């Protein structure tokens, strides 16, 4: 087959706080903003946020899709090298070596990942400014030492039902069996490498395994991030149940479940995309394995 889509690449900033994604909304923080509009509706003391989510959040959403779109020219050059290294027919037409072509892939791949971060650096400062507005909006609450946690605990019940609509049990079994076939495919092609005079086809399988290795790690990251949100929120429903907290403790409560649930939905969108990529690249390996003898 052929790698028709390369939406599995991503990039994080130097602080590793913000994770860029090619899929919308490109930020797990935007899902947190979508969830705070739900928090502000239950509070009759916060009414200015409806206009913030309608302008400041939509501007950050569109600027994110725009900043990702600028790297489309760089994305196609990286994708083009992926299709050359994995297809022996396309590689046999070009004149450069495989070591040179593989090093170009590693250089261009980081150029695309570096583009997504650098073009979104202005948006990274925009996310921080919206968080300070939310923290300032919570300060305007009338409660000081008597802030009710009913809205905070009612949201935990809503989240746990939404967590059940997640095939976490199916993803863990899938990734554990996919790796067993992966390392078996690794050890297999190296044993075969020394017994077959077919350098291009073997190298194409090696390169796909390098691509698969990157996607398996991105799959395990989001899969472990979905689990942490499910387990930590569950721990909140089985912990203390304070009737009234301080306004400072209330801000931390909304930012806790708000950040937990946003990472959950952000990982669910990525795990779906990363699942199709793992299946697709596994098909490309077997199509290359069947092409080992001839054609």
């Amino acid at each position, epitope marked *: 087959n052929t790698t028709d889509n390369i939406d599995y690449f991503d990039i*994080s900033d130097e602080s590793n*706080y913000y994770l860029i994604s090619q899929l919308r909304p490109h930020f797990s923080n935007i899902y947190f903003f979508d969830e705070f509009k739900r928090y502000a509706s239950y509070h009759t003391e916060i009414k200015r946020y409806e206009d913030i989510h309608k302008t400041k959040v939509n501007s950050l959403l569109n600027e994110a899709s725009r900043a990702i779109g600028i790297c489309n020219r760089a994305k196609n050059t990286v994708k083009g090298l992926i299709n050359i290294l994995e297809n022996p027919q396309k590689f046999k037409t070009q004149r450069e070596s495989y070591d040179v072509k593989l090093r170009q892939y590693e250089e261009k791949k980081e150029a695309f990942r570096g583009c997504l971060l650098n073009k979104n650096r202005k948006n990274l400062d925009q996310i921080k400014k919206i968080n300070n507005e939310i923290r300032d909006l919570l300060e305007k609450l009338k409660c000081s030492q008597d802030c009710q946690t009913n809205v905070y605990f009612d949201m935990i019940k809503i989240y746990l039902v939404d967590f059940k609509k997640m095939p976490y049990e199916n993803y863990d079994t899938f990734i554990k069996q996919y*790796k*067993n076939s992966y390392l078996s495919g*690794v050890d297999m092609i*190296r044993k075969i490498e020394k017994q077959i005079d077919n350098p291009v086809t073997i190298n194409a399988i090696k390169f796909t*395994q390098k691509e698969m*290795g990157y996607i*398996i790690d991105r799959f395990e990251y989001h899969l*472990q991030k979905v689990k942490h949100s499910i387990d930590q929120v569950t721990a909140l429903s089985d912990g203390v149940k304070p009737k009234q907290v301080t306004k400072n403790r209330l801000k931390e409560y909304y930012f806790n479940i708000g950040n937990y649930y946003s990472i959950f939905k952000f990982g669910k969108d990525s795990l779906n995309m990363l699942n199709k990529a793992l299946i697709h690249k596994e098909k490309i390996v077997h199509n290359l394995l069947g092409e080992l003898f001839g054609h």
Partner: antibody
Amino acid sequence: EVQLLESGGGLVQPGGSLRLSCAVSGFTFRNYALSWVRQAPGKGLDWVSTISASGGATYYADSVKGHFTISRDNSKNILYLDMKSLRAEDTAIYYCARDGGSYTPYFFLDSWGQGALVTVSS
Amino acid sequence: YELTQPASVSVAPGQTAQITCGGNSIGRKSIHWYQHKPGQAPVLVISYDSDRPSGIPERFSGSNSGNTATLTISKVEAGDEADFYCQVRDSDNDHVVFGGGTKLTVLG
């Protein structure tokens, strides 16, 4: 060049706890899988635990699952090893080593460190 | 899984060293060899049966067939004196397994 620098090892009492650290120079910390391998006095290399490049998966040894815990910090680019309950069997030199595979561990070691001595005695 | 390694091997300088690593159906697994000088960092000499990373001389060689894999050093020097370890990954429980170790003593 590529090198890994251990630090934190020393004297621990039986039952105490130690936090081992490992710095990196020569490559990007986020893109490679790391692991710990220890060598007891008069014994060979004993594999302890490995971790994925992003922390998605972690692997341990049977004689290790109880106490040792892998920790990663892709921001500060530091690799940790927390030892919960130290016994006399854990006196060894611990080598910070990185996996030669791409992001997910291929389970063969690419580079190694000089080692950090950990002594367990009162 | 268990890998078996002769504890000691003696070589005269200039001869060829052959360190063996054994196990059941070894010819179906990928084996990597490590050199370890005391006080220094171990070095991956041979990986995946026969491959050698950059910076490793052609004197080092690797084979693997049947029940044993052999690490071969063609023109042994006094600087190659170190204990060597073979390494395979146990795909069942998914962790790294090392051999017992083999002290390589060059008779200088």
